[PDB]
Amino acid sequence: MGPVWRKHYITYRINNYTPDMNREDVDYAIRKAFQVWSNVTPLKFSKINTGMADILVVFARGAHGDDHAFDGKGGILAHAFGPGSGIGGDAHFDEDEFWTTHSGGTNLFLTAVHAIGHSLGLGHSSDPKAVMFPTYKYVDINTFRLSADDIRGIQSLYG
Ligand SMILES: [Ca+2]
Ligand SMILES: [Ca+2]
Ligand SMILES: [Ca+2]
Ligand SMILES: [Zn+2]
Ligand SMILES: [Zn+2]
Secondary structure: OOOOOOOOOEEEOOOOOOOOOOOHHHHHHHHHHHHHHHHOHHHHEOOOOOOOOOOOEEEEOOOOOOOOOOOOOOOOOOOOOOOOOOOOEEEEEEEOEEEEEOOOEEEEEHHHHHHHHHHHHOOOOOOOOOOOOOOOOOOOOOOOOOOOHHHHHHHHOOO
């Protein structure tokens, strides 16, 4: 019923990089996360380095200029606005978390897949196998796959 992007070419921009990770690893994690959803839809995502992107990717802590403060280490890991102009689509990651490429800390790739779900208009799944389940779970990110419920969800919006 809700907001959806009404175009197939979507842009994203990385506003700032967490110091927790190698810059190339931030780039690859977010890229790979967008690929997850483009693999099952007609959407295409392109990274831009200047200008206004649809989806601004931000690492920030506490109160950071929207109405939804972060809460320090623990609890909230990230949030994302649904499709829309301005802040719509934007995905914010709590810098008080310790972001990684692996099972330690909080995996940036897995969090971004979930956050980007929301940026594309998905809500939460009650299916504990689904990436859009509300609770973070680390799974070997090599071999990661969307569930049938996640696929049904995003195809209900875009496909
Ligand atoms: Ca936006
Ligand atoms: Ca937090
Ligand atoms: Ca951090
Ligand atoms: Zn925010
Ligand atoms: Zn969520």
